[PDB]
């Protein structure tokens, strides 16, 4: 009786939200950006090839200096690369080799990683002893660790396969805030540029917008038909793009609280592993299972170019803070740095 | 045309590669086994016989180092992290023979043996393990023999029309799992009957792993 009545009220609230979103859908993003000229064909060459990983690479993250990057592979090695020279700055042996994510601290003093061991390990890069050591192991998730992102040297947000995201205080090693509400495995998260909000995509085909300080879900974004594997904030923080296993990328708006554009092609029938934006946000770069990285026009949903330089699934990619280059990691154990030429 | 600091920076990188290449050779000569099974199916017993989120166990037998990964604690979707084990030497699958007349505690309608068959079918026919051999263990042999005297095997398999003896009932169950093999060309299944007091469980794995090593060597050398 009471349970039946309550679940009927949830359907009414969902219908109310759907009608509200449809009410403000006066125009389409395609119509708005029809007049602007296309970006043309985007041709990028492999400037650098980072060799040394001997197994599948699962994650990479640029440092804020746009020169150093950290990559994680399931050969049990975290490697820090000097992208300008391809020199290896550090090689961090992982206690657990089943790593799925890695993060570079914005200060550059720390890196983080974690996988099927359900632990987010923090590594100090600037020690008086001259070696990288584990400074913290963040335990508490009951599923695999899918993504992690530093807010600063003391705070990091992790998403897990136990359907929850958490905000951690690194100094005390405890999660100050727990973000619950996903009914499936959360596969990725992206921090807003001001680091006051973050979005997460899960395997329930939904994306939730979370308030970091308050600790509750502000908005929920649906529309995908399968698990969301990748998510990335727009450079101004008012939008984000997701990549799912249904071979589609969608651009959701925070303020309009609904999807604006879908980025898919008929030839593409494989899942999407990673997504990122260019510095201006005009280009959306997405990694795919078909060994390729497709460059999309974010505004016009046109495939601007293709990065085809890997012999296995492109598992991760990232764009520098200055927008100078894009790195792609892949299951073929190589990382490649791409940029165009005049 | 590099400065004195950059020359040491490049020299440092070569020092790192000498250690990464060294570890790659060591990690390629060790055996990585993925351990699967059902609840109370003897999967935990095998670890005790061959002594967070994932439990990893190491043991060396006859100059061969084995890495056995137990993923019983992962309650999330299997399909997300299953590809992380693409490339394991072999898969050890534990099935409880005695759990043929029992049912799942939660489902209360699905037979416990049929649950193992569905799990085996999802792993044997999995795309990531197309050419991965399976070392199928059928544990609880003694308990299965006692229960088959009172409880007929027809309850689990209605199509079974054989003698009510272990020598014929167990062989029928073994063929049922092997019949689930959707690719009888690229892989073989090594079926073994263990027990709570057996001591040849590790020996079977070593011989089964050796045949997998030989098969990979033949593929590399071009004979196969």
């Amino acid at each position: 009786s009471e349970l039946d009545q309550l679940r009927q009220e949830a359907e009414q609230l969902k219908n109310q939200i759907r009608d509200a979103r449809k009410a403000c859908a006066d125009a389409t993003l395609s119509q708005i950006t029809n007049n602007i000229d296309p970006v043309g064909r985007i041709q990028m060459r492999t400037r650098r090839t980072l060799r040394g990983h001997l197994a599948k690479i699962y994650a990479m993250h640029w440092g804020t200096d746009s020169r150093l990057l950290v990559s994680a592979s399931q050969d049990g090695k975290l490697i820090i690369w000097d992208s300008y020279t391809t020199n290896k700055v550090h090689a961090i042996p992982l206690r657990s080799s089943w790593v799925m994510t890695c993060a570079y601290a914005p200060s550059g003093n720390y890196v983080a990683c974690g996988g099927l061991d359900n632990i987010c390990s923090i590594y100090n890069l600037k020690t008086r002893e001259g070696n990288v050591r584990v400074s913290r192991e963040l335990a508490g998730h009951t599923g695999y660790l899918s993504c992690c992102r530093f807010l600063d040297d003391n705070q990091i947000v992790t998403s897990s396969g136990d359907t929850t995201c958490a905000l951690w205080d690194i100094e005390t090693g405890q999660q100050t805030t727990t973000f619950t509400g996903h009914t499936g495995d959360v596969m990725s998260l992206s921090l807003a540029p001001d680091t006051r909000l973050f979005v997460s995509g899960a395997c329930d085909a939904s994306a939730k917008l979370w308030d970091v300080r308050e600790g509750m879900c502000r908005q929920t974004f649906t529309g995908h038909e399968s698990d969301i594997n990748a998510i990335c904030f727009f450079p101004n923080g008012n939008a984000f793009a997701t990549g799912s296993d249904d071979a589609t990328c969608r651009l959701f708006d925070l303020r309009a609280d609904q999807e604006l554009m879908t980025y898919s092609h008929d030839n593409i029938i494989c899942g999407i592993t990673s997504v990122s934006f260019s510095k201006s946000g005009r280009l959306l770069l997405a990694g795919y299972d078909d060994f390729n990285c497709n460059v999309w026009d974010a505004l016009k949903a046109d495939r601007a170019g293709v990065l085809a330089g890997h012999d296995n699934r492109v598992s991760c990619l990232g764009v520098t803070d200055d927008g100078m280059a894009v790195a792609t990691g892949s299951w073929d154990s190589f990382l490649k740095i791409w940029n165009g030429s005049s | 045309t590099l400065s004195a600091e950059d020359k040491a920076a490049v020299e440092r990188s070569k020092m790192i590669d000498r250690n990464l290449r060294e570890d790659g050779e060591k990690a390629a000569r060790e055996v990585k086994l993925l351990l699967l099974g059902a609840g109370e199916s003897g999967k935990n017993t095998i670890v005790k016989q061959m002594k967070t989120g994932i439990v990893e166990t190491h043991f060396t037998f006859k100059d061969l180092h084995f890495k056995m990964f137990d993923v019983g604690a992962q309650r999330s979707e299997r399909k997300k992290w299953i590809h992380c084990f693409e490339g394991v030497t072999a898969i050890i699958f534990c099935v409880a023979l005695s759990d043929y007349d029992l049912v799942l505690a939660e489902d209360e309608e699905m037979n416990r043996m049929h649950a193992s068959m569905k799990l085996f079918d999802s792993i044997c026919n999995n795309k990531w393990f197309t050419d991965t051999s399976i070392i199928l263990f059928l544990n609880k042999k003694d308990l299965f023999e006692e229960k088959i005297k009172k409880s007929p095997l027809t309850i689990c398999y209605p199509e079974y029309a054989g003698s009510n003896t272990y020598e014929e009932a167990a062989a029928y169950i073994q063929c049922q799992f092997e019949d689930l093999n959707k690719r009888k060309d690229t892989k073989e299944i090594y079926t073994h009957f263990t027990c709570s007091t057996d001591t040849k469980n590790v020996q079977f794995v070593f011989d089964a792993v050796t045949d997998v090593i030989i098969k990979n060597n033949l593929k590399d050398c071009g004979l196969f």
Partner: single-chain antibody
Amino acid sequence: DVQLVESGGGLVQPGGSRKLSCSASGFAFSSFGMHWVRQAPEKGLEWVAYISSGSGTIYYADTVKGRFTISRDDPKNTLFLQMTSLRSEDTAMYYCVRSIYYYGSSPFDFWGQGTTLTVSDIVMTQATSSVPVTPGESVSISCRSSKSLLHSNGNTYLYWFLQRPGQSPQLLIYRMSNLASGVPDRFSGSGSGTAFTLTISRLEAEDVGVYYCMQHLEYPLTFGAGTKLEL
């Protein structure tokens, strides 16, 4: 804690041989390149030798090449300097210096206490030998180089060290602008091309000492004469 203890120094006869050891504790010795730097009495700093991490690269100063041998024992974390045919010119305090080289590292950051030995090329110039100073006042120290220390990669390989009376040298500024870890922010390094300035805002009692500018563009590493601050 990070420690570097040198031993083996003492009074030796001319033409003799002596073996200097530098034992390292509290840090990953095998990850750091190691230098020996000496300072003649009432003179400036003088670089002696360098051995890289992994012992693959070895450099010597011209004045000692062929007579001195530098070696390391990574399992024992000991640095060695085998000396032969010792001359009266070799009378100096020999310092053990660690330096690690990767992008963003701070070479020459830690120096040993030194051992005393008594026997019975880019030019770095610090013309101003002494500067009378008062606490709380801003001081600038000038250094000059015969060659431009700015490399084509954007780095300017100039280092600043402070040797307080009775103490080992300490790194202040590495690559002409960066401030070493544990150094107060009042120190600032400014330069261009061949002319460099070290600015010390709000001078304190601890800052009193001799200041050396070193070039790291190429070997041999050469030091300036040094500028002393006195009250």
